[PDB]
Ligand SMILES: C=CC[C@@H]1/C=C(\C)C[C@H](C)C[C@H](OC)[C@H]2O[C@@](O)(C(=O)C(=O)N3CCCC[C@H]3C(=O)O[C@H](/C(C)=C/[C@@H]3CC[C@@H](O)[C@H](OC)C3)[C@H](C)[C@@H](O)CC1=O)[C@H](C)C[C@@H]2OC
Ligand SMILES: [Cl-]
Ligand SMILES: [Cl-]
Ligand SMILES: [Cl-]
Ligand SMILES: [Cl-]
Ligand SMILES: [Cl-]
Ligand SMILES: [Cl-]
Ligand SMILES: [Cl-]
Ligand SMILES: [Cl-]
Ligand SMILES: [Cl-]
Ligand SMILES: [Cl-]
Ligand SMILES: [Cl-]
Ligand SMILES: [Cl-]
Ligand SMILES: [Cl-]
């Protein structure tokens with residue numbers, strides 16, 4: 067297992083697409099999964115866009131680090147250690163304690 071977060075480029079969007087920088091409100095399409103078994107716990111595909119302010123710590127740390135630097139249309143895979151996810155708490159009744167997480171993410175907009 068990695069010492070920290072792994073971020074993989076799955077595909078590149080627009081070369082001059084707006085860039086996700088700290089302080090921006092960014093809009094992301096995602097699928098979240100438990101890394102240990104691949105079970106999917108959430109997606110917003112076909113639902114409303116998920117917006118968050120990058121860098122303020124409202125999302126798990128793996129997202130604040132992992133989404134940073136994306137340009138619109140980029141797709142990334144995030145592999146997130148427990149300390150950069152929900153740690154001993156878990157979440158949603160869906161993520162057990164001490165879970166490694168995987169997310170597929172696509173940047174849709176930057177505001
Ligand atoms: C305070 C206002 C309530 C507000 C609640 C809602 C809008 C309800 C709505 C269903 C929330 C999420 O859906 C958008 C839902 O998302 C999941 O399904 C999911 O896929 C996930 O993991 N996501 C969502 C996408 C961004 C990454 C991550 C996250 O970081 O989510 C964030 C998260 C839970 C962070 C905690 C916050 C507390 C810290 O202590 C902890 O610190 C480690 C990290 C979300 C976006 C928060 O910022 C927003 C809120 O909490 C969880 C499996 C379960 C979670 O429902 C609970
Ligand atoms: Cl890569
Ligand atoms: Cl590409
Ligand atoms: Cl694109
Ligand atoms: Cl753009
Ligand atoms: Cl969609
Ligand atoms: Cl910020
Ligand atoms: Cl802040
Ligand atoms: Cl750049
Ligand atoms: Cl960890
Ligand atoms: Cl932890
Ligand atoms: Cl929570
Ligand atoms: Cl499980
Ligand atoms: Cl795990």
Ligand SMILES: [Cl-]
Pocket residue numbers: 097170
């Ligand atoms: Cl997928």
